[PDB]
Design a protein around this nucleic acid. Structure first.
Ligand SMILES: [Mg+2]
Ligand SMILES: [Mg+2]
Ligand SMILES: [Mg+2]
Ligand SMILES: [Mg+2]
Ligand SMILES: [Mg+2]
Ligand SMILES: [Mg+2]
Ligand SMILES: [Mg+2]
Ligand SMILES: [Mg+2]
Ligand SMILES: [Mg+2]
Ligand SMILES: [Mg+2]
Ligand SMILES: [Mg+2]
Ligand SMILES: [Mg+2]
Ligand SMILES: [Mg+2]
Ligand SMILES: [Mg+2]
Ligand SMILES: [Mg+2]
Ligand SMILES: [Mg+2]
Ligand SMILES: [Mg+2]
Ligand SMILES: [Mg+2]
Ligand SMILES: [Mg+2]
Ligand SMILES: [Mg+2]
Ligand SMILES: [Mg+2]
Ligand SMILES: [Mg+2]
Ligand SMILES: [Mg+2]
Ligand SMILES: [Mg+2]
Ligand SMILES: [Mg+2]
Ligand SMILES: [Mg+2]
Ligand SMILES: [Mg+2]
Ligand SMILES: [Mg+2]
Ligand SMILES: [Mg+2]
Ligand SMILES: [Mg+2]
Ligand SMILES: [Mg+2]
Ligand SMILES: [Mg+2]
Ligand SMILES: [Mg+2]
Ligand SMILES: [Mg+2]
Ligand SMILES: [Mg+2]
Ligand SMILES: [Mg+2]
Ligand SMILES: [Mg+2]
Ligand SMILES: [Mg+2]
Ligand SMILES: [Mg+2]
Ligand SMILES: [Mg+2]
Ligand SMILES: [Mg+2]
Ligand SMILES: [Mg+2]
Ligand SMILES: [Mg+2]
Ligand SMILES: [Mg+2]
Ligand SMILES: [Mg+2]
Ligand SMILES: [Mg+2]
Ligand SMILES: [Mg+2]
Ligand SMILES: [Mg+2]
Ligand SMILES: [Mg+2]
Ligand SMILES: [Mg+2]
Ligand SMILES: [Mg+2]
Ligand SMILES: [Mg+2]
Ligand SMILES: [Mg+2]
Ligand SMILES: [Mg+2]
Ligand SMILES: [Mg+2]
Ligand SMILES: [Mg+2]
Ligand SMILES: [Mg+2]
Ligand SMILES: [Mg+2]
Ligand SMILES: [Mg+2]
Ligand SMILES: [Mg+2]
Ligand SMILES: [Mg+2]
Ligand SMILES: [Mg+2]
Ligand SMILES: [Mg+2]
Ligand SMILES: [Mg+2]
Lengths: 122, 59, 137, 204, 117
RNA sequence: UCGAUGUCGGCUCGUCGCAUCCUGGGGCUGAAGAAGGUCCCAAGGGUUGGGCUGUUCGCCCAUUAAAGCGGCACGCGAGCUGGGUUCAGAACGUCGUGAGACAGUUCGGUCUCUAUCCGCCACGGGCGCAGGAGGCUUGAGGGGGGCUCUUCCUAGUACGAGAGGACCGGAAGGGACGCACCUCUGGUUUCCCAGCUGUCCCUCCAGGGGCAUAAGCUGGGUAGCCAUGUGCGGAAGGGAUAACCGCUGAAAGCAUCUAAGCGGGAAGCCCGCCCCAAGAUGAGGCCUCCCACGGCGUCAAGCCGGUAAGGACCCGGGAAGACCACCCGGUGGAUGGGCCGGGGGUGUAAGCGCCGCGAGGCGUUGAGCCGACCGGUCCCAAUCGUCCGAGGUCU
RNA sequence: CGAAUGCCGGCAUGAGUAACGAUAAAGAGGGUGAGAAUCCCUCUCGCCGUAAGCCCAAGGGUUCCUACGCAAUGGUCGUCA
RNA sequence: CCGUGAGGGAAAGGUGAAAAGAACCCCGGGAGGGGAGUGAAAUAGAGCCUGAAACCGUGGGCUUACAAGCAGUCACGGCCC
């Protein structure tokens, strides 16, 4: 349950260590963004020679959450830090890679590049 | 002295009508199948109690 | 009527008494992971098993591995179509029933605190029905 | 029109082989009809139904054995199905077939004088910054001198719950008429032991 | 909305556990205790549990009764005067009766807790 | 109104208007399509989260379909905040010889337990409904909800001086919002279990208890209640409509939607959906049960005394509940408490034996303890009872 | 005399309503007595223990103690004070 | 009584002729009663003559539970005196 003012340990090679979720991109007045949704995020920490910089307000897909993603099959995945992938504005990843695990809700959310590019889609 | 206060004196009518439901209910009394005193029900009152009841002063 | 949960257990023909009855030791095996148009996707799962909350049916147990940079917990229903859920080391010895203490520490203290359930790892190994007494009598 | 009386007996998630459908278990028992309310003496085309028949001579003046399998009247008392018309007797569950939606109408779990911030989801007040005795109060309940009254539909503290509530479009996921159960997907209202009537759908 | 639930209360926790202990120390000693009725109706479960622990004549049961009744000179009297006195009465030892001649001056209904003979 | 109408803003709760910001219709368009512009109908639903300011208002940020303009004592202080402003203190700029003054800033600055009546939310008692009662229910009249987006197929084809991209429909997901519920996830769980401290005590060791947030603390915690969880809901569908387009057609031999007529047509209106609801004196209906007159007249007598069918009183209770009600029970009884079993929570109890100088580790032991849950079992408690309760004559 | 937010006295209403003056905490068995949760005793429970314990000044003045009482004062009752 | 103090500063009369101020019962712990007695009178019985009104009761008549009001008034009608 990412909401505004969340920090998100960014997982890709863009230049972002941590992004703060500015505004969730769901409908009109959406409360939270769970996994697989698009947030808007302002980059607060910097890989030094990064593509993005400390301040580039950029959209991001949420790939991990501390809150339990109750899948329809009864089980629930739960990660151990909120994570986001920086996303170019056509809903496509910005970095060449992505670090550890993502949730597999991203395939039906429409983030198949992340699910191909992530080393363990749990 | 303060914020919530009676705007007017409640007269005899509304006072003695609000004191309607404060009429006391008469207590319930049943006649104790050993000897005829009026215990309340389910009550080991000072005659014998129930059959073979816990006694005040009796055999 | 008078059997308000005997109804609820007789209704549960969905039960699966074929999984191992583990304590919070270490279960590592498959799940269902149906995706991509094809069902037959049998992704394993490593990990210490943290909690086993029970309700008779639908006892849903949590298994936490630390995958690739971070922790990940998964709360499996235990009576779904999980194929196999065999455990690598019936271990721990596990004073705590529901062991959420491996969240704050995520390190060699896991090794130092889920040390050895040598009792159960001896007896559920010496429950080897793996002799060569078949096809003779 | 597909009505039954039953008991909510609990919830259990079961599995339709792909997901975990979180059903409840209605004990929609074999309900004997006790009076078919005809539209020419009442105007209803309704049917009074019954429930559990073991009533050891607590059956006072609605003794009423004017049905051929009256099954002396339950203290699991009579209710109606408003547009029903059965064809045989003691309607069980077989009227419902798995895959049809139902509306379950039951008395919800009453929460007493569950005053507001619980009854009408008010936002209460601030827990800090200032005074304290307004943390769960409704705050304003009107305007000044014009209207100079509280609107009569005002949301305030009241007897929350214990009123009949109907959840529309609950999928019947299964029936077990080996013991005459009825399994609908979702939240049948009421305690696990309370009475729920289960009606036909108002989809169409 | 509580009271979908179990037992009753009027004092705090460490007062209720040691209210049940103090009425148990007097019911197991004397036999007839004249409390109010709502004290008595949850005295009966506690002392029924103590009698039933004492019905198990073993040492862990002695220590479990001693977990409540800090007197042990009492539990002598319990384990060889009250525990074998039933020996057959499966459950439900103490009885509670309401009283007339109520608690005059605060009007509480008094109640008399016998064990049983 | 100065023998006081507390005053700006925010919070909270709203409710209304339409002169509409979206959403639904529609007309023109300098409307290829997509957009849009403007205007007509249209409040039923909405109308976000932030940064700054005491701010309403603004400027932005990121969205959105839209981030409406107002009213309601610039709604709302017997609801709250006081940041501001209108108290004393202080200071700065300034004016003043000066005390002092400044909608000129700056820092600080008591915002008052009890609701009498109406109002409202609830829940009752009385009496009524020409018999008296147990049930059940029609629904007069209300009230609640009334949203809306994205994606896909339509097809990337109609259209296209262009390559963007439809109308008409149909699915699939979302976003809030409401109802309901513990199955899940997740909280709490106040003593259910465990560990540990320090001290004191029981009995020295062991074991245990008291006290240390009214739980010592810490780790867990079933039921319960709950949302962040789950399942639902918005409607389809009639009918009449607004704007707007009609068909037929005169007055006026032509036309014109109109004067006679009749059709389409809006999230709007009524009914549909959900809930209350016969106190709807209009007091309903249906099914069932019980029914003398003996007594005091210008008479089944208006008043009582015994009546039943029933209802209370009482008691055991309850996912019912402030009380009262409501529902369940009262020996024929599983209603509460107990015990027994199971679920469940804890996590190998105590004791013994063995290993170790020893703190401890070991087996017995998933043992023991066990709050509600699910059921059994009369073992205890609902024993006993007492009191109301028609006898209907009337067009 | 009808008014002066009049004055003095009385009695209302508010109202059997708010409260009863520390969330240190009580429970039982005997007494005594006409009468008891409240008085006495017993046995547990709790609370302070750099005091909620002792001692002395300040102050108050007989509250000390015993016996007979309970109208009045004890925010209830009271045999107790 | 208030005030440290200077000072302020109250209320509070009436049994009957005479105490003849109630012996003795009965209820009650007593207070208080009811008898008896006193006295012309005891609703003259003790901080007691008369003892009004507000107020608070009880008994009776009329009246109200589909009603709306500055509470009345006028009009009829009903019902006990
Ligand atoms: Mg940089
Ligand atoms: Mg820069
Ligand atoms: Mg106030
Ligand atoms: Mg009065
Ligand atoms: Mg009265
Ligand atoms: Mg190490
Ligand atoms: Mg309830
Ligand atoms: Mg809040
Ligand atoms: Mg306050
Ligand atoms: Mg304050
Ligand atoms: Mg219960
Ligand atoms: Mg003024
Ligand atoms: Mg005034
Ligand atoms: Mg065009
Ligand atoms: Mg308009
Ligand atoms: Mg509006
Ligand atoms: Mg407004
Ligand atoms: Mg204002
Ligand atoms: Mg104020
Ligand atoms: Mg006000
Ligand atoms: Mg201020
Ligand atoms: Mg302040
Ligand atoms: Mg100067
Ligand atoms: Mg300060
Ligand atoms: Mg009131
Ligand atoms: Mg379509
Ligand atoms: Mg839960
Ligand atoms: Mg200790
Ligand atoms: Mg201690
Ligand atoms: Mg404590
Ligand atoms: Mg729990
Ligand atoms: Mg023509
Ligand atoms: Mg038409
Ligand atoms: Mg309507
Ligand atoms: Mg009626
Ligand atoms: Mg038990
Ligand atoms: Mg278990
Ligand atoms: Mg052991
Ligand atoms: Mg040795
Ligand atoms: Mg058990
Ligand atoms: Mg359960
Ligand atoms: Mg006067
Ligand atoms: Mg005047
Ligand atoms: Mg005058
Ligand atoms: Mg005066
Ligand atoms: Mg007075
Ligand atoms: Mg009041
Ligand atoms: Mg009150
Ligand atoms: Mg009070
Ligand atoms: Mg303490
Ligand atoms: Mg202490
Ligand atoms: Mg003395
Ligand atoms: Mg007195
Ligand atoms: Mg007194
Ligand atoms: Mg004496
Ligand atoms: Mg003085
Ligand atoms: Mg004289
Ligand atoms: Mg006398
Ligand atoms: Mg006098
Ligand atoms: Mg006189
Ligand atoms: Mg009268
Ligand atoms: Mg009328
Ligand atoms: Mg009338
Ligand atoms: Mg008039």
């Amino acid at each position: 349950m990412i909401q505004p003012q969340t920090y998100l340990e960014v997982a890709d090679n863009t230049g972002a260590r941590k992004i703060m979720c500015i505004r969730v991109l769901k409908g009109s007045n959406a409360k939270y963004a769970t996994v697989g949704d698009v947030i808007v995020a302002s980059v607060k920490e910097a890989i030094p020679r990064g593509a993005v910089k400390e301040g580039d307000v950029v959209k991001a897909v949420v790939v991990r959450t501390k809150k339990e993603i109750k899948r329809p099959d009864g089980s629930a995945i739960r990660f151990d830090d909120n994570a986001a992938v920086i996303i170019n504005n056509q809903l496509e990843p910005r970095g060449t890679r992505v670090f550890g695990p993502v949730a597999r809700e991203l395939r039906e959310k429409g983030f198949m590049k992340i699910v191909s590019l992530a080393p363990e889609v749990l | 002295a303060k914020h919530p206060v009676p705007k007017k004196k409640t007269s005899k009518a509304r006072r003695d009508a609000r004191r309607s439901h404060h009429a006391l209910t008469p207590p319930t009394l049943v006649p104790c199948p050993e000897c005829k005193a009026m215990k309340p029900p389910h009550t080991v009152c000072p005659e014998c109690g129930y059959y073979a009841g816990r006694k005040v002063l009796e055999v | 009527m008078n059997r308000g949960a005997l109804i609820k257990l007789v209704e549960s023909r969905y039960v699966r008494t074929d999984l191992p009855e583990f304590r919070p030791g270490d279960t590592v095996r498959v799940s269902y992971k149906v995706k991509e148009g094809n069902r037959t996707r049998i992704q394993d799962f490593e990990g210490i098993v943290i909690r086993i909350r029970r309700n008779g049916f639908n006892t849903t147990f949590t298994v936490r591995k630390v995958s690739y940079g971070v922790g990940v917990e998964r709360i499996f229903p235990l009576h779904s179509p999980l194929i196999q859920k065999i455990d690598i080391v019936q271990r721990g010895r596990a004073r705590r029933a529901k062991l959420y203490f491996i969240r704050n520490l995520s390190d060699r203290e896991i090794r130092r605190k889920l040390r050895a359930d040598r009792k159960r790892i001896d007896q559920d190994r010496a429950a080897e029905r793996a002799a060569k007494e078949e096809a003779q009598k | 029109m597909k009505g039954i009386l039953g008991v909510k007996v609990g919830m259990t998630r079961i599995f339709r082989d792909d997901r975990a459908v979180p059903v409840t278990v209605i004990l929609a028992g074999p309900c004997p009809v006790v009076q078919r309310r005809t539209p020419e003496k009442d105007g209803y085309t309704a049917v009074q139904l019954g429930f559990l028949p073991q009533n050891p001579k607590r059956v006072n003046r609605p003794l009423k054995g004017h049905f051929a399998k009256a099954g002396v009247e339950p203290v699991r008392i009579l209710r109606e199905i408003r547009d029903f018309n059965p064809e045989g007797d003691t309607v069980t569950v077989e009227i419902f077939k798995p895959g049809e939606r139902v509306d379950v109408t039951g008395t919800s779990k009453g929460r007493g004088f569950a005053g507001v911030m619980k009854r009408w989801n008010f936002a209460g007040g601030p827990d800090s910054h200032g005074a304290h005795k307004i943390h769960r109060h409704p705050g304003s309940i009107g305007n000044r001198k014009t209207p100079g009254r509280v609107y009569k539909g005002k949301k305030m503290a009241g007897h929350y719950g214990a009123e009949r509530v109907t959840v529309m479009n609950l999928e019947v996921v299964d029936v077990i008429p080996e013991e005459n159960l009825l399994l609908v997907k979702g939240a049948v209202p009421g305690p696990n032991g309370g009475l729920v009537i289960v009606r036909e759908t108002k989809k169409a | 909305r509580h009271l979908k639930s179990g037992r009753k209360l009027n004092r705090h926790s460490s007062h209720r556990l040691a209210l049940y202990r103090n009425q148990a120390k007097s019911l197991l000693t004397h036999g007839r205790i004249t409390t109010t009725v709502p004290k008595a109706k949850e005295l009966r479960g506690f002392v029924d549990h103590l009698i039933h622990l004492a019905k198990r004549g073993d040492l862990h049961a002695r220590r479990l009764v001693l977990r409540d009744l800090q007197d042990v000179k009492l539990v002598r009297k319990l384990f060889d005067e009250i525990a074998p006195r039933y020996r057959d009465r499966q459950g439900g030892y103490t009885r509670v009766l309401k009283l007339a001649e109520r608690r005059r001056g605060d009007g509480a209904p008094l109640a008399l807790v016998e064990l049983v003979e």
